[PDB]
Amino acid sequence: GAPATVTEQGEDITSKKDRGVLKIVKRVGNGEETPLIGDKVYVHYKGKLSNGKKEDSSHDRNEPFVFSLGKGQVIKAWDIGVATLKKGEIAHLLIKPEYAYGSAGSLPKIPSNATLFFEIELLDFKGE
Ligand SMILES: COc1ccc(CC[C@@H](OC(=O)[C@@H]2CCCCN2C(=O)[C@H](c2cc(OC)c(OC)c(OC)c2)C2CCCCC2)c2cccc(OCC(=O)O)c2)cc1OC
């Protein structure tokens, strides 16, 4: 499925080049600018456990998910991955646990050593 396609075709966007965060651009965005640390970022997303069975989406609440980029407000893979997106871009991320919840997990929601998959649409971003 989509996770396997990211393994096969995804770009390694980690600094260590350990393939811990792999990305496919599914829809190209506009212009050249990508968000800076501190920017208010607005996204729609769907996230799941790649193996396990748990599913989460901002469409559930039918409102965008908002966070400040690069402040450790979200898992490391998002700070890394969303920084590489343009406005209007949709991307797939496959995320190994080292860039998510690691060995601790976040039980009951997230098991230990879990791989996560997300589809993320970057709606907009703004300086404060
Ligand atoms: C720096 O590390 C962390 C920082 C924050 C967290 C909490 C989960 C953090 O979620 C995440 O970082 C990732 C990426 C963003 C969308 C949500 N997300 C999740 O994993 C989802 C998620 C969604 C949640 O509710 C919306 C969670 O409840 C807080 C949650 O808790 C562990 C996890 C998963 C749900 C199961 C299926 C796979 C996805 C979170 C959730 C809701 C709002 C958040 O920030 C907005 C703000 O604070 O205004 C941050 C975990 C962190 O690492 C373990």
Author numbering: 13 to 140
What is the paper's account of this structure, in its own sentences?
Here we used the FK506-binding protein 51 (FKBP51) as a model system to evaluate whether chemically engineered proteins can be trapped in pharmacologically relevant conformations. FKBP51 has emerged as a promising drug target for chronic pain, obesity, and depression. The major challenge in FKBP51 drug development is selectivity toward its closest homologue FKBP52, as the binding pockets of both proteins are very similar, but the biological functions are opposite. Selectivity for FKBP51 can be achieved by targeting a transient conformation characterized by an outward flip of phenylalanine 67 (F67in and F67out).41−45 This conformation is rarely populated in the apo-state of FKBP51,46 but enables high selectivity vs FKBP52.47,48 To stabilize the transient binding pocket of FKBP51 (F67-out), we aimed to lock this conformation precisely by the formation of an intramolecular amide bond (sites displayed in Figure 1B).
Two positions, K58 and K60, were identified as promising anchor points for lactamization to the residue in position 67. This was expected to trap residue 67 in an out-like conformation and stabilize the β2-β3a-loop by a seven (i, i+7) or nine (i, i+9) amino acid macrocycle. Protein crystallography of the ligand-bound proteins confirmed the desired 3D structure of the synthesized and refolded proteins FKBP5116–140 F67E/K58 (i, i+9) and F67E/K60Orn (i, i+7). The protein fold, the ligand binding mode, and the conformation of the β3-strand were identical to recombinant FKBP51. Notably, the side chains of F67E/K58 and F67K60 were well resolved, which unambiguously confirmed the desired lactam bridge and its F67-out mimicking conformation. In contrast, for the lactam-bridged variants, fragments resulting from cleavage between F67E/K58, F67E/K60Orn, and F67E/K60Dab are undetectable because the covalent bond formed protects the protein from fragmentation at these sites. Lactamization within the protein was expected to shift the conformational equilibrium toward the F67-out-like conformation. This should result in a higher binding affinity of conformation-specific ligands, as the energetic penalty to adopt the F67-out-like conformation is reduced. Indeed, when we compare the Kd values of recombinant FKBP5116–140 with the synthesized and cyclized variants, we observe a 6–10-fold tighter binding for the lysine/glutamic acid cyclized variants.
